[PDB]
Amino acid sequence: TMMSVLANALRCIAGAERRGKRQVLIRPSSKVVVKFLQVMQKHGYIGEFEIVDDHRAGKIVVNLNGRLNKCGAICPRFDCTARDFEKWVKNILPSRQFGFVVLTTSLGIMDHEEARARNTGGKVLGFFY
């Protein structure tokens, strides 16, 4: 069955970007999905998205702009210390000049550049470049 709705949504988005579409529909969506999207939107990687409400888990329509190359979840959510940020960057990123590794800390979901500034750590969620 469906075990991870975060892995699902990130697979739909990277799939639509590979084909060349302009919009995607994502189900069933959740709080973690929305907070992950806001991190990509704030860095200027997707564009406007909207949440349609049924009296269930909703659906999300996301507009693309041809900037995303790949996005994927990391499973299982390993643990990262503030000194361990580089090791993850060397492994799952094309270069250290650009890209992001999204973590969940006790402050909240946020990428590794912001996490280093606040000097925290936590469990990795995914990445995008």
Partner 1 sequence: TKTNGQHAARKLVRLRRKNRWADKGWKKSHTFVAQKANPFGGSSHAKGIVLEKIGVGAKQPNSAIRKCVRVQLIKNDKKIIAFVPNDGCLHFIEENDEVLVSGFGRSGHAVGDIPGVRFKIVKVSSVGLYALYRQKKEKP
CB closer to partner 1, 3 vs 117: 3
In the complex, the smallest distance separating the C-beta of residue 4 from partner 1, rounded to whole angstroms, is 11
Q: Which of these segments, 27-35, 55-63, 70-78, 99-107, binds partner 1 (CB under 8 A)?
A: 70-78
Three-class HEC string of the chain:
CCCCHHHHHHHHHHHHHHHCCCEEEECCCCHHHHHHHHHHHHCCCCCCEEEECCCCCCEEEEECCCCCCCEEECCCCCEECCCCHHHHHHHHCCCCCCCEEEEECCCCEEEHHHHHHHCCCEEEEEEEC
- Residue 91 in the binding site for partner 1 (CB under 8 A): no
Report the residue from 51, 52, 57, 61 that binds RNA according to the rule CB under 7 A: 57
Chain residues binding partner 1 by CB under 8 A are: 75-77
